[PDB]
Swiss-Prot record, chains A, B:
Upper lineage: Bacteria, Bacillati, Bacillota, Bacilli, Lactobacillales
Subcellular location: Secreted, Cell wall
Superkingdom as given in the UniProt entry: Bacteria
Name this protein carries in UniProt: Immunoglobulin G-binding protein G
Ranges for the Sequence repeats: 2-56
Length: 56, 56
C-alpha cells in the first residue's frame, strides 16, 4: 500500500510518499531517509492515513 | 508554490513534495535530497506540473 512521511524538520518540511508491503517496511525506509537527511526528530504514526510524522 | 520530485532510483522510488519560492530553489533542495540518499541519476523537469524526475 501507499505510506507517507510528513517531514517537520528544522530545514526539511515536505511530504514523501512510497509504496511498501507493510507499515514496518515503510517505517524502516522512512527512518533511513530521515537519517540520510540528518533529520533527528520525534516519530508518530497515524494508522488511518498510513502517515508517519518526524518532528524536530 | 508546490514543487515535486519523482525519485526513480534503484532503491528509492517515491514522490517528494515541498514548497519553494521558485523552481531553482526547489531544484537545489531536491538535488541535496538526492545527494544525501546516494541517488546519482539523470534529471528532467516538467514546468506544467512543477515536477522534477531523477532517474538512475
Ligand atoms: Cl500497493
Ligand atoms: Cl523536505
Ligand atoms: Cl528507531
Ligand atoms: Cl506557496
Ligand atoms: Cl524513495
Ligand atoms: Cl547539478
Ligand atoms: Na519496499
Ligand atoms: Na497501519
Ligand atoms: Na525554501
Ligand atoms: Na516552472
Ligand atoms: Zn503495496
Ligand atoms: Zn528536504
Ligand atoms: Zn510558495
Ligand atoms: Zn527512498
Amino acid at each position: 500500500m501507499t505510506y507517507k512521511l510528513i517531514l517537520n524538520g528544522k530545514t526539511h518540511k515536505g511530504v514523501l510518499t512510497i509504496e511498501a508491503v507493510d507499515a514496518a517496511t515503510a517505517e524502516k525506509h522512512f527512518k533511513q531517509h530521515a537519517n540520510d537527511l540528518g533529520v533527528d526528530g520525534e516519530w508518530t504514526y497515524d494508522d488511518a492515513t498510513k502517515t508517519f510524522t518526524v518532528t524536530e
